[PDB]
Design a protein around this ligand. Sequence first.
Ligand code: U6J
Ligand code: CL
Ligand code: F
Ligand code: MG
Ligand code: MG
Ligand code: MG
Length: 135
Amino acid sequence: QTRTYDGDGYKKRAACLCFRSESEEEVLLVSSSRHPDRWIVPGGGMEPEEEPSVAAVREVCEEAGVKGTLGRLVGIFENQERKHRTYVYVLIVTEVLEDWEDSVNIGRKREWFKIEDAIKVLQYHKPVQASYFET
Ligand SMILES: O=P(O)(O)O[C@@H]1[C@@H](OP(=O)(O)OP(=O)(O)O)[C@H](OP(=O)(O)O)[C@@H](OP(=O)(O)O)[C@@H](O)[C@H]1OP(=O)(O)O
Ligand SMILES: [Cl-]
Ligand SMILES: [F-]
Ligand SMILES: [Mg+2]
Ligand SMILES: [Mg+2]
Ligand SMILES: [Mg+2]
């Protein structure tokens, strides 16, 4: 659970865009922990000496209960207001697990969204996560 930081003091995070297929038309979002009626892109803190691609796959297993084929690094995204820096990867989902860590522990929810709808639900509270999809 040890948080890690870049040299400028930003928290290091990693996340995946968890697509249903290689056509990248539908993405899996998970409920906010603070506010369960809102949606976020699953992701979280890198552990010490943990590769960003390893952290990304690990956090989406913990938070979303999915596994799959790791794809490209999309980019590195800062949240200036919250002082964190996130590596965002494509993941093509091949396994959907029941009773995953956050479902059991905090009743976290997950749902497939068409890309345009994911951008819509992220915009108000998570505009940087909406920007993950701009490419
Ligand atoms: O509980 P998570 O994992 O879904 O995510 C939380 C962040 O947790 P994060 O996803 O970064 O880490 P992890 O707990 O490793 O997933 C946490 O970050 P932290 O600062 O480390 O407590 C951040 O706080 P902020 O960085 O102060 O804006 C918010 O609590 C955020 O809650 P959400 O986006 O409403 O679900
Ligand atoms: Cl898809
Ligand atoms: F976490
Ligand atoms: Mg997490
Ligand atoms: Mg998280
Ligand atoms: Mg974590």
